[PDB]
Structures are given as C-alpha cells and as structure tokens.
Structure 1
Amino acid sequence: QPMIYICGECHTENEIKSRDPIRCRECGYRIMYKKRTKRLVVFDAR
C-alpha cells in the first residue's frame, strides 16, 4: 500500500504514507521524487 519515494540529497529510499510530513527519515529533506513504474515498456527502435 505505501509507496516508495527517493530523498534527493540523500539518494535514500524511504516510505511515506498519505497525509504525512514529507521528510527523509534521517535528514528530513523536503524535496521528494517518485520512483519508476513496474509496468513494462517497449520501444520500436524507429
């Protein structure tokens, strides 16, 4: 259920649940990115 986000400056993986402060568990950074999808992807070389 909870999603996997990435700190940025730490580069560290962290978990966050909805309606929660957006802080890294150890440095408490505020910028938060989201990880790539698990769904497949396929491009024709064209």
Structure 2
Amino acid sequence: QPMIYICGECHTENEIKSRDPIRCRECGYRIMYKKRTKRLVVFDAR
C-alpha cells in the first residue's frame, strides 16, 4: 500500500512507499508532508 507524501510546491504525490530516501521526483525540494487519511472522522457543530 502507498504512503503518498505530497511534496512542497510541485503539488504532486511523491509516491514514495518504501525505505528509499525521501526526495520528490522531478521537483528539486526534499521536504515532504504526509497526506490526509481517507479514514472518516467527525466534528460536532456545537
């Protein structure tokens, strides 16, 4: 299963999902930012 990993500015998935070093293909940045969970939460409008 993928661990996505949107990167800064390029606005695309890094896609890295393994032990290999973090660095976004095409885009020269090396900061990542793990993507939101698909798992549902909930918020009360109170």
Point out where structure 2 has 5 or more consecutive residues left out of the alignment: none
Point out where structure 1 has 5 or more consecutive residues left out of the alignment: none
- How many residues align? The count is 46
> TM-score scaled to structure 2, two decimals?
0.77
Point out the structure with the larger strand share. Answer: 1
Deviations 1:1-46 (A, max 9, x none): 1211111121111210321111111024210001111111211111
- RMSD, aligned α-carbons: 1.3
> TM-score scaled to structure 1, two decimals?
0.77
Distance between the aligned counterparts of 2:21 and 2:9, measured in 1? 17
Structure 1 stretches (4+) deviating beyond 2 angstroms? none
What is the aligned-residue identity percentage? 100
